[PDB]
A paper describes a structure:
During incorporation into the MT lattice, GTP hydrolysis is triggered by the catalytic glutamate in α-tubulin (E254), which becomes juxtaposed to the GTP in β-tubulin at the longitudinal interface between dimers. GTP hydrolysis has a destabilizing effect on the MT structure, and polymerization can only continue in the presence of a GTP-tubulin cap at the growing end of the MT. Here, in order to better understand the GTP conformation of MTs, we used cryo-EM to visualize MTs assembled from recombinant wild-type (wt) and mutant human tubulin in which the catalytic glutamate in α-tubulin was mutated to alanine or asparagine (E254A or E254N, respectively), making them deficient in GTP hydrolysis.
The dimer twist was found to be −0.19° for the 13-pf 3-start E254A MTs grown in the presence of EB3. These data suggest that lattice compaction can occur without hydrolysis, regardless of whether EB3 is added before or after MT formation. Overall, these data continue the trend that EB3 compacts MTs and promotes a more-negative MT twist. Here, we found that E254N and E254A MTs also do not show any pf opening at the seam either in the absence or presence of EB3 (refer also to Movie S4 for a morph between E254N MTs and wt MTs showing the rotation of pfs proximal to the seam).
Numbering used by the authors:
A (entry chain C), D (entry chain A): 1 to 37, 40 to 42, 47 to 441
B (entry chain I), E (entry chain H): 1 to 429
C (entry chain M): 1 to 131
């Protein structure tokens, strides 16, 4: 009766969707064929039910290159999905926001919108959309920008959360990532009700340090991101001692409308061989969360301020221990709150412990924690992009590709001033008040 | 979906194409007869990119063979891997262009261009969603150079938004296989910079050096050189015909690798390359390949890259590997090599990863490099052009076919403009 | 033709209940005291009249509406006007007709945004249009 | 005791007859040899009964070229039909209304009328005639026009339904379809108690989109039309929660005598592979019906008005959900009713679910819906024909074939003015009145 | 049911008729002896259209052979598939018309026209309900031209409302097989335009070109040309002798393709056509056939259709196919080719589909085109006529048989009126 649909844009979106829906199928005891041989109808959120025992997800997988969609279709999770929401294009945007937003994205936007409206019209208590896309690829950035525009025009007040793959500072896979990132950020700034940044370099570092996997693959990063999303949706999907909804996320984490960019962190992340040797107390895992190494963005929060934080616990969690841990965190030296916010902590508790996927890398634990922080150091990252942008905008590099596909140079300019204005706003929020 | 029409012109183009289709047949598991004898559905799930499925479960290449002398076509037909081609595509002349670019672009090419374009039009109508064209030819002989320039011009005027690949053999710096190759190369490069989205310069001297030093082959036949060229071509295209943890295609590589429309001349490279006996003495891991590429001795272009700057670098991988190791090596090779990369392109490396290794080898890769060093090449040719145009050497041959000195002057001026353009972007800060 | 806008998250541009109620009261010269009374739809129809000359036909709309089917018919007229002017914001008549605060206020705040988007500066008497 | 006979004219008529009578034989459990190894005598409507258990249909298959009739005779359904109602001509009309209405049609019309009278005289409560014919072929158009004249003259007031193959806008098989179409429409406008337009292009699009049959044949279109006809006759042939008769169709769908041209739509149309993954709620199928893509004519209703609609549901259909779905349809934006009709919905309910043909393309469902809508956008289609006609009438093309076969040029003219008058009537109905 | 009498005139007529009856015998599975050796009742359910049931389960063709020299008749009798024809129908002369139209229409033809018409009347009385007649002859020789014109005149005066087909070989533009073919062709076309409901112009040069280029036959014998003509005949008629998802007959094609009574001269085409080796390398799909037809190289008429406009186009199909694909291909080929089709005939394409393929081939088709390009043909002949009538070349030969110069003048004037008529409807808007 509480519905919330997912929209996966780009190849990264599709792979994270594979991971997330595998995790969901394990969580609710659903076979890949859709049958079912601390729990409410918990699955009614993500899984719509047919006449028989078959359950199908409420998600849309869209990508202009049919490769990953064919892999999903021919994969193990074949019978599960309804064949319509596996939408393919013909040619990829090829890391071109122009191609993914003006030239090709228009050719299939109507079909995607029609499938979304069919999905929504049969729901009862739809809360919102979980958008999984990257800023690197042209498909992800451009098509997501267009889709958020159209959804905002069509649906008035539904929370629209973005779990984007923010481009890394030094470990970059493309060459034109800054252009696409600036364009998509400037476009989605006025539709993204809350956007959660996550970076590849930090997750690589976490995997090498904690999971002890010297050579991790994207499967592992998708597993961690899926765990984050499951922790976020646990309150909706399960009984909890202290429930929290999506509107609560959108309200407690966004002090100003333009500054809506929290970052995520998960704990504990320890291997089965290291599953023992420590009891994983709530204070211990919270200390691990607030440690700058376990964060999933290449930014040091100790050089900024914390406007807000939201901690979600799941499992056998004792609330007084939660209070003691929070107080101890507040007392420490590396956590100074901003002047205008004397209370920046939200707490949610769920009884359902995290679900361990067979063949995975993590270990089955009894308590788990997701940390969502809206802090100030993230603004520093923006500066880097701006600098990069300006460098590649000094010589008009790669501009012709966008120009010849329905883009204006003034759009690049206005994106640049909008990013500079966002940085100025972040800096102004950073300072303290008089008196 | 995303079908590619492959054209080969000249004897060089014909031979590299024969080897290329051999390599593709091995990759997709196809008999000489054209039947499927593979063992994994992955080989057939994207067979349509290069192969048209005729009746009775048979697959034919989507290739066009063009020449002006029947010897090459007869050689292709007679040998193995010859029955799979469609005979109507066997378009050939009778006299040969005689190593003259004018006859290959104006006189003789005009007698077969119409038929070639009708075949191209039929194939384009038959395919589902055309991706682009790739041409294999050379700039030394008259036939390949002139006919390829004419075909590229006509096709791009028939299809503006499609992309066109040209894999042109550039004459060696030390020795010259022909005598009047300056004029032919100048006019061909003029046409290419006019109407091509990218080009891969390939040099015979560099291939000989690679075969002798790295491969330890004391008797390198042309078959081996064509095999390396075909392996490079297949490594470039592999991101489209098979799944991967990070999929790419020709369009992504073109967009990432071309910051300015004129600058679309690249160098290819392949890895790993080991001698017959020296194969088991080395572990095939990601850093080994990465350190094997970024060096002069593994570049198929006759120009030391360290004389200039790296503008962009595309790297395609094949085989099950961890992406983090790939990314770490890319970051390290960029960081320790800050001097040779352009500063005003931060993160000037494109990375693509497939999942299917190339026929035996546990994993391999492919290197495309957009660097300014190739400008030296152009200058050398330009100088030779002047050395042969100040005194009007062999000029009357091309004058007797109706083309006048003004095309020579315009082509020389445009090439010099390209050289200065490379120099300016090399000196940018 | 008419331009269209949206409303996702903006500060210092969200007006209070009483302020918008005074705005509608002053722009149509009447005495609504509850914003959910805008479920009638007559105010929206006269607003469309004032935004574009003609573009509607007020004879069909029933300013004395007091039942649900009357609300539905008025919203059908409003939807026809929206289609005629090319504004493509689908309106949730099903939630509006029940007359509850949430969707009524949402629709009126979006409509205030759209009204500010497409108003010129003309003056007239709302009564003559109303009768 | 409630009888209604069928008349199939032209090759299209005969093929849709094959499909419809296959569907009927399956519905009532009739072997092709006429034996019987939510049900009342349900079969007494279409099937007359002999002394033994053999049942024979009350239908007339008439066609001037003996090819299709020979195929029916030598086909599987050989023993079923009474050999008299398989009436053949000798030469085909060859897309010539004149040949099918004045020269050749007269030579066998008396036999057809005699057989129809023989069928009628042994009935008890005959409601009417279901005429299946095309406007393209000369046989269909001309012979149907003549037969409608003779039946109207002979039988005073019995409902006469026409399920015609309206010529498509761009996908045509003939060249002289405009002349035949205007002539037959002008002729039958005074006899067709209700004519239901259906177009080939739209059914092709439906089959490609929904059935996922990349290469459908006429068999599938005939199956769909047979399903429509069976849904129409379900109320007569079966028990229902809310029954509806043919006179009800003729009354609720015809506001003005000259405007009697509804269009048909069927739902759901989904394959067995896609039979799962959605529950096919009544609201869902009704939304699919009112979607402009699922309509079977290339005319988009969103640029016109809905004068009337008649929806027939069959299967396990709960009436409150019907009411809720209809209300939601009425609330939407793409359905604007005409001023003079404040109530344009008729609803019928039948308990018998639709019957699946073995070897068919659809999937066995539990609920089914037929939408029969008299709207205004259909008038647009007429305009197209008119334009074509005038073009073909600009240079007097193909006129000699009609002139030298017993036709006057004044007939073509008067058909043209009558058709223009029909368009003007449609337009004046479309507009709104004062006060 | 719907029986057709086939008449053959001239050596060309007899040869094409013999090969045509061979093709029909293969289609219906009949021995040269005339017995039935097929395996499907579909072959026999409509055997009566061309074959008459003699006693003892024997089938004889409903064909009449006419000539003035015994050589052709002896050749037909002696060879295989010759015992099937019923002997009295072998009506022949002794001297031959000597390539003179007057002797074939006035002097010699008058001595056998009565016997031919007695046979025709007997056959018409014996048939159930006659459909129409089809004539296979040529306009070059005197015998075929004159005798066919006379027969068509007398028959159409004996049967007004029946339909009559003529498959007339029109002289080639480049070379002329005879010398005085202008007069013969002019008079024959005059008679045809008076008393024929349609005609299929066929040209030897076009057939040679198709055989050499498309069929890749370096040594095309006349048998192959007659094979293509007979295949065209069978493809045209197949809609009547077998069931189909959309049945047609001769009358439907005549009504659809003839907008004006004079304009009834068409061009035939066949598909698919492939070389011996190039057959398996191609998938035979509906769009492949559609793109094979709409081009000059597959038209049996010696005139490029793109010089003029398409008035109407009839397309007959054979083989199990999806009708929507047929319809989509027709719509696409009309939409992308809006320029060459007449505007004031919207949707100017007739489509017919049968169910029986024509042997070895799983599906095939047949093309009939009513276009104005053929007018060029007429003008050429007209010019030659003037070039040979201004100086009275060979005129005394036809003057010595009783024909008058006035008759030549009326024939030329009527042909020029026809040319202007085509020109006017080509310029209509
Ligand atoms: N963490 C993580 N990032 C991924 C994964 N897959 C793709 N990415 C990111 O996606 C970027 C590549 O561009 P994409 O967004 O995937 O491009 P696309 O969606 O294929 O669309 P095109 O650019 O048109 O091909 C890389 O920079 C990665 O950071 C994944 O599995 N895990
Ligand atoms: N890599 C490689 N290059 C080759 C090979 N064979 C020939 N070439 C190059 O191709 C050039 C041959 O000239 P072509 O372009 O083929 O000239 P052509 O097509 O024969 O036309 P004509 O010169 O008129 O006879 C030489 O300059 C060689 O450098 C080969 O086997 N491998
Ligand atoms: N949807 C559909 N349409 C058909 C079918 N069969 C024939 N038609 C239509 O019929 C038209 C052909 O003309 P017909 O009415 O069949 O002509 P006829 O009944 O054979 O009579 P003649 O014209 O004298 O041959 C085509 O345009 C088709 O649209 C069918 O099975 N399904
Ligand atoms: N397509 C085709 N045409 C042929 C063939 N044989 C002859 N012709 C044509 O037929 C013409 C022969 O003249 P005919 O009409 O047969 O003259 P005839 O019947 O022999 O009478 P006379 O000329 O008096 O001897 C030539 O112009 C050829 O173009 C053939 O085998 N195939
Ligand atoms: Mg992509
Ligand atoms: Mg050569
Ligand atoms: Mg018929
Ligand atoms: Mg002779």
């Amino acid at each position: 009766m509480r519905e919330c649909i997912s929209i996966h844009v780009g190849q990264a979106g599709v792979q994270i969707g594979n991971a997330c829906w595998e995790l969901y199928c394990l969580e609710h005891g659903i076979q890949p064929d859709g049958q079912m041989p601390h729990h409410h109808d918990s699955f009614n959120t993500f899984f719509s039910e047919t006449g028989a025992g078959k359950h199908v997800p409420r998600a849309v997988f869209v990508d202009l290159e049919p490769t990953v969609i064919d892999e999903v279709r021919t994969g193990t999770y074949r019978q599960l999905f309804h064949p319509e929401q596996l939408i393919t294009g013909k040619e990829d945007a090829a890391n071109n926001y122009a191609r993914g937003h003006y030239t090709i994205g228009k050719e299939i936007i109507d079909l995607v919108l029609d499938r979304i409206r069919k999905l929504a019209d049969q729901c009862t208590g739809l809360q919102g959309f979980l958008v999984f896309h990257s800023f690197g690829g042209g498909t992800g950035s451009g098509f997501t920008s267009l889709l958020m525009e159209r959804l905002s025009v069509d649906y008035g007040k539904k929370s629209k959360l973005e779990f984007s793959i923010y481009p890394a500072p030094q470990v970059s896979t493309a060459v034109v990532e800054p252009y696409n990132s600036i364009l998509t950020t400037h476009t989605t700034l006025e539709h993204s009700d809350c956007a959660f940044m996550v970076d590849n370099e930090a997750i690589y570092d976490i995997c090498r340090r904690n999971l002890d996997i010297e050579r991790p693959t994207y499967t592992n990063l998708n597993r961690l991101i899926s765990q984050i999303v499951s922790s976020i949706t646990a309150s909706l999907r399960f009984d909890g001692a202290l429930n929290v909804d999506l509107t609560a996320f959108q309200t407690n984490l966004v002090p100003y409308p333009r500054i809506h960019f929290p970052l995520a962190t998960y704990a504990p992340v320890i291997s089965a061989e290291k599953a023992y040797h420590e009891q994983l107390s709530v204070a211990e895992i919270t200390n691990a969360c607030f440690e700058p190494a376990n964060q999933m963005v290449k930014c040091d929060p100790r050089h900024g301020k914390y406007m807000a934080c939201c901690l979600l616990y799941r499992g056998d969690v004792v609330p007084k221990d939660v209070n003691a841990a929070i107080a101890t965190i507040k007392t420490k030296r590396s956590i100074q709150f901003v002047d205008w916010c004397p209370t920046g902590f939200k707490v949610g508790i769920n009884y359902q412990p995290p679900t361990v996927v067979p063949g995975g890398d993590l270990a089955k634990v009894q308590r788990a924690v997701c940390m969502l922080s809206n802090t100030t150091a993230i603004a520093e990252a923006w500066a880097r992009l701006d600098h990069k942008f300006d460098l590649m905008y000094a010589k008009r590099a790669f501009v012709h590709w966008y120009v010849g596909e329905g883009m204006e140079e003034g759009e690049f300019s206005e994106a640049r001033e909008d990013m500079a204005a966002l940085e100025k706003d972040y800096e102004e929020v950073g300072v303290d008040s008089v008196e | 979906m995303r079908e590619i029409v492959h054209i080969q012109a000249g004897q060089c183009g014909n031979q590299i194409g024969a080897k290329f289709w051999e390599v593709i047949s091995d990759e997709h598991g196809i008999d000489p007869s054209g039947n499927y004898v593979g063992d994994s559905d992955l080989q057939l799930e994207r067979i349509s990119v290069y192969y048209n499925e005729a009746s009775s479960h048979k697959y034919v290449p989507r290739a066009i063979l063009v020449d002006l002398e029947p010897g090459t076509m007869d050689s292709v037909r007679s040998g193995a891997f010859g029955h799979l081609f469609r005979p109507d595509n066997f378009i050939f002349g009778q006299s040969g262009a005689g190593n003259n670019w004018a006859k290959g672009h104006y006189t003789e090419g005009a007698e077969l261009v119409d038929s070639v374009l009708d075949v191209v039009r039929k194939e384009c109508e038959n395919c589902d969603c055309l991706q682009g064209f790739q041409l294999t030819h050379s700039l030394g002989g008259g036939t390949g150079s002139g006919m390829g320039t004419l075909l590229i011009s006509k096709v791009r005027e028939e299809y503006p938004d499609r992309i066109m690949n040209t894999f042109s053999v550039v004459p060696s710096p030390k020795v010259s296989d022909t005598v009047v190759e300056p004029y032919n190369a100048t006019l061909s490069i003029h046409q290419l910079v006019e109407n091509t989205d990218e080009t891969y310069c390939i040099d015979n001297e560099a291939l000989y050096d690679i075969c002798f030093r790295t491969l330890k082959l004391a008797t390198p036949t042309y078959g081996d050189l064509n095999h390396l060229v075909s392996a490079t071509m297949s490594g470039v295209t592999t991101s489209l015909r098979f799944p991967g943890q990070l999929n790419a295609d020709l369009r992504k590589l073109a967009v990432n690798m071309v910051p300015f429309p004129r600058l679309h001349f690249f160098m290819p490279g392949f890895a790993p390359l080991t001698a017959r006996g020296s194969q088991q003495y080395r572990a095939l891991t990601v850093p080994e390949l990465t350190q094997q590429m970024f060096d002069a001795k593994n570049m198929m272009a006759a120009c030391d890259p360290r004389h200039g700057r790296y503008l962009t670098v595309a790297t395609v991988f094949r085989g099950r590997m961890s992406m983090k190791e790939v990314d770490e090596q890319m970051l390290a090779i960029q960081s320790k090599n800050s001097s040779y990369f352009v500063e005003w392109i931060p993160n000037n490396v494109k990375v693509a990863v497939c999942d299917i290794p190339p026929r035996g080898l546990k994993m391999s890769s492919t290197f495309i490099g957009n660097s300014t060093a190739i400008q030296e090449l152009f200058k050398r040719i330009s100088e030779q052009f002047t050395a042969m145009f100040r005194r009007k050497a062999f000029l009357h041959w091309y004058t007797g076919e109706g083309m006048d000195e003004m095309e020579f002057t315009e082509a020389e001026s445009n090439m010099n403009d390209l050289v200065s353009e490379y120099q300016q972007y090399q000196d940018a800060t | 033709m008419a331009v269209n806008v949206y409303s996702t998250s903006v500060t210092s541009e969200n007006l209070s209940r009483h302020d918008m109620l005074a705005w509608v009261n002053d722009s149509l010269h009447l005495n609504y005291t509850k914003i959910e009374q805008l479920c009638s739809g007559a105010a929206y129809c006269q607003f469309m009249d004032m935004l574009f000359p003609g573009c509607v036909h007020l004879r069909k709309v029933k300013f004395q509406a007091k039942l649900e089917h009357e609300y539905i018919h008025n919203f059908k007229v409003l939807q026809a006007a929206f289609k005629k002017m090319g504004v493509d914001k689908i309106i949730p008549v099903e939630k509006l007709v029940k007359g509850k605060f949430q969707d009524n206020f949402e629709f009126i705040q979006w409509f205030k945004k759209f009204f500010d988007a497409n108003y010129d500066g003309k003056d007239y008497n709302p009564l003559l249009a109303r009768q």
